[PDB]
């Protein structure tokens, strides 16, 4: 990570526990993502990303494609 920003995404669509693993990897699998904190009960995912590699849009695009609404 060259430049890691800690971003917290509010997530509409995680009603189940399997969603946790799904979305966390959906971000994590993306090269440039450092760590992901998927908070199922809170409806937020706090991700540390290297914005010198992965973009914010990349994160959102993949997450929503997996079936989540994130702001």
mmCIF file of C-alpha atoms in Angstrom:
data_model
loop_
_atom_site.group_PDB
_atom_site.id
_atom_site.type_symbol
_atom_site.label_atom_id
_atom_site.label_comp_id
_atom_site.label_asym_id
_atom_site.label_seq_id
_atom_site.Cartn_x
_atom_site.Cartn_y
_atom_site.Cartn_z
ATOM 1 C CA UNK A 1 0.000 0.000 0.000
ATOM 2 C CA UNK A 2 1.474 3.305 -1.149
ATOM 3 C CA UNK A 3 -1.377 5.534 0.009
ATOM 4 C CA UNK A 4 -3.969 3.807 2.170
ATOM 5 C CA UNK A 5 -7.228 5.557 2.972
ATOM 6 C CA UNK A 6 -9.637 4.214 5.583
ATOM 7 C CA UNK A 7 -13.094 4.370 4.010
ATOM 8 C CA UNK A 8 -16.331 3.290 5.646
ATOM 9 C CA UNK A 9 -19.111 2.257 3.275
ATOM 10 C CA UNK A 10 -22.713 1.983 4.421
ATOM 11 C CA UNK A 11 -24.181 -1.195 2.995
ATOM 12 C CA UNK A 12 -27.806 -1.905 2.156
ATOM 13 C CA UNK A 13 -28.260 -5.557 1.268
ATOM 14 C CA UNK A 14 -26.564 -7.605 3.972
ATOM 15 C CA UNK A 15 -29.413 -9.486 5.587
ATOM 16 C CA UNK A 16 -27.533 -12.762 5.970
ATOM 17 C CA UNK A 17 -24.256 -13.978 7.437
ATOM 18 C CA UNK A 18 -22.942 -15.387 4.148
ATOM 19 C CA UNK A 19 -23.133 -11.822 2.831
ATOM 20 C CA UNK A 20 -20.339 -10.928 5.266
ATOM 21 C CA UNK A 21 -17.832 -13.296 3.652
ATOM 22 C CA UNK A 22 -19.125 -12.457 0.186
ATOM 23 C CA UNK A 23 -18.821 -8.673 0.369
ATOM 24 C CA UNK A 24 -15.635 -8.684 2.457
ATOM 25 C CA UNK A 25 -13.899 -10.739 -0.219
ATOM 26 C CA UNK A 26 -15.615 -8.774 -2.982
ATOM 27 C CA UNK A 27 -13.518 -5.870 -1.742
ATOM 28 C CA UNK A 28 -10.575 -7.918 -0.424
ATOM 29 C CA UNK A 29 -10.017 -9.864 -3.662
ATOM 30 C CA UNK A 30 -9.524 -6.547 -5.400
ATOM 31 C CA UNK A 31 -5.788 -5.834 -5.688
ATOM 32 C CA UNK A 32 -4.991 -2.718 -3.700
ATOM 33 C CA UNK A 33 -7.319 -3.453 -0.830
ATOM 34 C CA UNK A 34 -5.487 -3.907 2.442
ATOM 35 C CA UNK A 35 -8.015 -4.824 5.120
ATOM 36 C CA UNK A 36 -11.795 -4.940 5.306
ATOM 37 C CA UNK A 37 -14.033 -4.573 8.328
ATOM 38 C CA UNK A 38 -17.475 -5.793 7.349
ATOM 39 C CA UNK A 39 -19.867 -4.950 10.151
ATOM 40 C CA UNK A 40 -22.964 -7.063 9.474
ATOM 41 C CA UNK A 41 -24.999 -5.707 12.370
ATOM 42 C CA UNK A 42 -24.044 -2.108 11.671
ATOM 43 C CA UNK A 43 -24.560 -2.132 7.930
ATOM 44 C CA UNK A 44 -21.124 -0.706 7.242
ATOM 45 C CA UNK A 45 -17.852 -1.945 5.766
ATOM 46 C CA UNK A 46 -14.701 -0.142 6.872
ATOM 47 C CA UNK A 47 -12.004 -0.767 4.271
ATOM 48 C CA UNK A 48 -8.378 0.321 4.155
ATOM 49 C CA UNK A 49 -7.529 0.747 0.471
ATOM 50 C CA UNK A 50 -4.434 1.758 -1.412
ATOM 51 C CA UNK A 51 -5.875 4.467 -3.618
ATOM 52 C CA UNK A 52 -2.607 4.362 -5.549
ATOM 53 C CA UNK A 53 -3.722 0.974 -6.866
ATOM 54 C CA UNK A 54 -7.449 0.397 -6.446
ATOM 55 C CA UNK A 55 -10.044 3.138 -6.873
ATOM 56 C CA UNK A 56 -13.086 3.994 -4.771
ATOM 57 C CA UNK A 57 -15.328 3.313 -7.753
ATOM 58 C CA UNK A 58 -13.810 -0.160 -8.211
ATOM 59 C CA UNK A 59 -14.769 -0.974 -4.634
ATOM 60 C CA UNK A 60 -18.334 0.288 -5.043
ATOM 61 C CA UNK A 61 -18.855 -1.195 -8.519
ATOM 62 C CA UNK A 62 -17.876 -4.708 -7.446
ATOM 63 C CA UNK A 63 -19.823 -4.509 -4.177
ATOM 64 C CA UNK A 64 -23.043 -3.402 -5.862
ATOM 65 C CA UNK A 65 -22.563 -6.006 -8.602
ATOM 66 C CA UNK A 66 -22.577 -8.604 -5.827
ATOM 67 C CA UNK A 67 -26.040 -7.339 -4.935
ATOM 68 C CA UNK A 68 -25.510 -4.558 -2.408
ATOM 69 C CA UNK A 69 -26.473 -0.904 -2.340
ATOM 70 C CA UNK A 70 -23.611 1.188 -1.020
ATOM 71 C CA UNK A 71 -23.242 4.947 -0.653
#
